[PDB]
Design a protein around this ligand. Structure first.
Ligand SMILES: [Cu+2]
Ligand SMILES: [Cu+2]
Ligand code: NA
Ligand code: NA
Lengths: 620, 620
């Protein structure tokens, strides 16, 4: 069996047993993260050894532990106690979400704040939000969540339409104490509902949409073997799933004639941060690390046939661990299908008389996650012509506030009295490259303009330049859309038939990066998001751009510390980290439920093949 | 009934009869352009007066004429004799292209150049290309084409694989004279063939692609009335066709409740320039104005069901004039269909228990044109959520040269001895805006970064600023991807329910603009291409960014001359001109036939609606 196969329910049950017998999984213990470890570097790695990494939380207040288990041999490999004031707290537990609202419901200060606003405590929902690191010295070493309140007029009401501004509370979820309740003043609670299924708001549903039927009468063109190995139109890869990162792609390769040629060893979205740009003290701390703090894989949706995924769909149902080590299946959590993608190539030639048209198609691997008010779709696309593309789709309900009388420079008005603070959604793609093998390098390619004069007498010439990034200290790069800047990952030891190194070109969308002040807490904790491109030398413990323990970590972990080793990256085993994001000034059309907006990146072959790789596509 | 209906064969025959009766279309005359004029401003106006504009060429060398005729009344409205050395030559005629190869085949200088290369003149194809304006004083006032040679080994051979470098000739196509033959030296003719249907090159065709079937059992959701009026999912528009511009969209409007709200009065691609960046004297003059010089609508393909357009397709077959005034139908030249477009909106709410998913779709209007080696697809998209998007798809065969022995800074190597010069493909979209009516203004929106300090103590705030463009002299704008720059077209006299002006936001791709030296001939003739955004006050005669007569015209017309009027554009009838393009450094994978690459722009509502406009979309 493949070492890259999905974790099975049986594997997770064995991890639980091993931890139990070792004395590491008592009634006070909770599993905050569990995932399978990738095989170590080894082109001849023979014996099967499936190992799992576990973060163990203690609800009584004892120190948490990081444990590595071998399910193959049934042993604990290492177990380290963690000093969370130094290295960061563990990810937020699903069961800690409920605790915030219930603790506040009995706090005298919370109740007095609600009574001043004539709000029934039974109708006040509390969003439990990650705390970050700011000025409160008493929070160092404690698990803190912060809570913001929303009113639910009835059980099916959309609470996001009724933010309770001017009020925030901080809670220690281990000792179960409310540390602070801050009331900065009374704002009216917006009264309009935002119930997008209420006929009063939708009006009569349209009757004009006729069905679109997409079928594959002979079944799909791809095959799935060993549970998660995909072969499709010369592509070969393994579809993994991790509770923190979500869908992970392994061993992406392309069959060029008789040879299977590697392209990407591992592709994932290794972090995503949602920083808010409202300076009100009610929200100026608000930054979601959806991947690092919340774990986007554990909130993956079950995707419905004909609604979420349309066509001839093949599903995967990944298995994760719950907080006690029991396996939990995410039924239909991953959709896979191919779809038509228009014209691939076309030419009508006057001189030869030949008319030629071929159609394109793409393989789609997707999942959707829901973190509170937000819903995100993650889509990986493989195209016939060798292009690889990632797309994030952002939808859900925007996070709301009051709209202040007299307006705001940092908040959009969506409805009478209802605001939506400005924010960004910034992703980090971790691309462990393997262009024809592991000896790779990155070049930055800029367009070069030339001045009219000798050798360019008509002033028409233009050119390009490539700069090799040779060391990590010079491999932190910024976009430059005006000069057409792209980055090429090549293998200097593998040449095409023209004797040039084979390569792939990364095309970014060139959206703005992190806008916060460079001195801010979020700029230190999300340093990856301040630059478009980072290149590191591969190391097996350098997994996330924000470090292993993001929750309440003081800053600098991850990419800034990796880069500081200043390692050789010129013709080496390297990892590309690409930052890309959406800057969201909410519009009235985003309310009461937001239409999808998108961002992504793509990689295209650049002299990887000896000619077009789609000459053998049939005419249809 | 509709004044925006497509021209009919009868109208074109009637124009021919009117011109003949008036003495303007004798046997020495040729129609170089014929198109219907849009109604003048005034909702109602002329009851029905269909007017046509005609450019009449004279093959005996007499001066050409611009003529306006009323087909309704059977009259010539105006006829002006043109001074082409001043205002520009007429577009190239299809019959002039054939002249070039035939004239050169009997020229002693051409024959000696081919004899020096051991080439058989019967196998040498000549690409006839527009001449531009350079240093040759004898070309002023004459219709010139320039020829580059390619060898065709046999009648079905792709001649583009065999460029004859070092050789170019200039031809007067009216007096039938070869003016100059320039031979800068013998280059080897690349010998490899580029025949992408030859099994020796394709290999065995794939048997792995299973069919994808897209059908609409109840027919499409849009209706077509009056030949070219579309209603689809609250959108309303008319699809026009012009032999110069191709597909033109008129009267784009959205039905919001019981109000039909205008958005765009007229949308077209009003110019497209393809400048080459090779400083060799054999090619340094090479710039295609596909729209203005060649007329892209004239070369539209007939699109094949199931190959070019897949699904439940509705076709339009526009009628154009040939060079004698006879109607010519372009059968199946426009495809229209709706497409599934994934998730529209999605949210699973923990507090209400409601799970909500809706799917998106788009309406597609497309045509394809072939100009020599290149093929371009023009796609207009309408989405459920009010988004409008344009996409250009570039494919075909790249233009080739020899690859010099010691390499090149301006040419890519594609195959042994075979080069492809660097070039760009740059488009100008002309958007005659009508956001809720004709009183519009444009604002430039930049993100604003804020420094940590008083009122921003945690350094997290960020904002935006909008700058109104009030006069034409300040409305020539550049992109700035780093600051997230976009442009908003709003109506200051039409407010949404929050008392804010309704608007649409233009999102650019922020690709490089024209790279040539600003002193060059092409920078003067294609001045529009040097900036991303221009805004003018509407005027009936300001139709193209390059002026009416582009062929062999120096600078002095087009957008720089319009802008000098410095007209008020703050709440007025305005036109937005957006430049966007691809910079093409050809790759090996582009050879021997290029996979599609794309570029475009989109417009999204920005407080145009009072809430999401897709709340009434059904589940299905
Ligand atoms: Cu957002
Ligand atoms: Cu090109
Ligand atoms: Na690597
Ligand atoms: Na206008």
């Amino acid at each position: 069996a493949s070492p890259f196969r999905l974790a099975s329910a049986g594997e997770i049950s064995e991890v639980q047993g091993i931890l139990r017998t070792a004395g590491l999984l008592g009634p006070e213990k909770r599993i905050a993260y569990l995932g399978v470890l990738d095989p170590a570097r080894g082109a001849g790695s023979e014996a099967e050894d499936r190992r799992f990494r576990v973060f163990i939380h203690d609800v009584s207040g004892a120190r948490p532990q990081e444990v590595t288990v071998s399910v193959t041999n049934g042993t604990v490999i290492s177990a380290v106690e963690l000093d969370t004031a130094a290295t960061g707290e563990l990810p937020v537990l699903e069961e800690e979400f409920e605790v915030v609202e219930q603790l506040l419901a009995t706090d005298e200060r919370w109740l007095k704040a609600l009574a001043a606003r004539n709000l029934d405590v039974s109708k006040v929902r509390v969003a439990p939000l990650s705390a970050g690191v700011f000025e409160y010295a008493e929070e160092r070493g404690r698990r803190i969540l912060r809570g913001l309140a929303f009113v639910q007029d009835f059980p099916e009401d959309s609470a996001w339409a009724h933010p309770v501004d001017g009020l925030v509370a901080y809670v220690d979820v281990v000792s179960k104490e409310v540390t602070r309740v801050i009331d900065t003043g009374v704002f009216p609670v917006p009264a309009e509902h935002g119930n997008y299924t209420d006929p009063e708001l939708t009006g009569p549903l349209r009757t004009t949409q006729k069905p679109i039927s997409i079928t594959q009468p002979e079944g799909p063109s791809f095959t799935v073997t060993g549970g998660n190995h995909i072969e499709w139109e010369k592509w070969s890869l393994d579809v993994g799933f991790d509770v923190r990162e979500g869908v992970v792609l392994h061993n992406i390769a392309f069959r060029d004639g008789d040879r299977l040629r590697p392209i990407i060893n591992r592709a994932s979205i290794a972090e995503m941060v949602v920083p808010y740009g409202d300076p009100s003290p009610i929200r100026s701390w608000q930054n979601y690390f959806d991947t690092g703090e919340y774990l986007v894989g554990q909130y993956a949706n079950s995707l419905e046939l004909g609604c979420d995924c349309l066509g001839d769909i093949t599903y995967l149902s990944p298995v994760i661990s719950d907080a006690f080590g029991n396996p939990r299946e995410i039924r239909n959590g991953i959709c896979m299908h191919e779809e038509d993608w228009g014209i691939l190539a076309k030419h009508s030639d006057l001189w030869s008389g030949i008319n030629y048209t071929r159609r394109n198609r793409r393989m789609v691997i997707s999942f959707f996650t829901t973190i509170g008010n937000y819903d995100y779709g993650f889509y990986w696309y493989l195209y016939l012509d060798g292009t690889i593309e990632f797309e994030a789709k952002a939808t859900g309900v925007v996070f709301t506030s009051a709209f202040p009388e007299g307006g705001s420079d940092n908040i959009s008005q969506l409805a009478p009295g209802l605001g939506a603070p400005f924010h960004q959604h910034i992703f980090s793609a971790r691309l462990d490259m393997a262009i024809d093998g592991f000896t790779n390098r990155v070049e930055e390619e800029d367009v070069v303009r030339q001045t009219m004069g000798p050798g360019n007498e008509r002033g028409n010439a233009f050119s390009r330049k490539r700069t090799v990034l040779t060391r990590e200290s010079e491999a932190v790069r910024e976009a430059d859309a005006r000069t057409g800047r792209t980055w090429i990952i090549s293998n200097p030891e593998s040449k095409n038939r023209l004797n040039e190194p084979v390569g792939y070109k990364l095309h970014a969308h060139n959206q703005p990066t992190l806008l916060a002040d460079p001195g801010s807490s979020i700029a230190r904790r999300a340093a990856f998001a301040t630059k478009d491109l980072w290149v590191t030398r591969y190391a097996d413990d350098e997994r996330y751009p924000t470090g292993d323990f993001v929750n309440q970590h003081s800053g600098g972990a991850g990419l800034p510390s990796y880069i500081a080793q200043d390692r050789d990256i010129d013709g080496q085993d390297i990892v590309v980290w690409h930052t890309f994001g959406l800057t969201h000034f909410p519009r009235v059309e985003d309310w009461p439920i937001m239409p999808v907006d998108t961002v992504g990146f793509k990689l295209r072959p650049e002299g990887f093949f000896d000619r077009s790789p789609v000459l053998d596509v049939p005419a249809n």
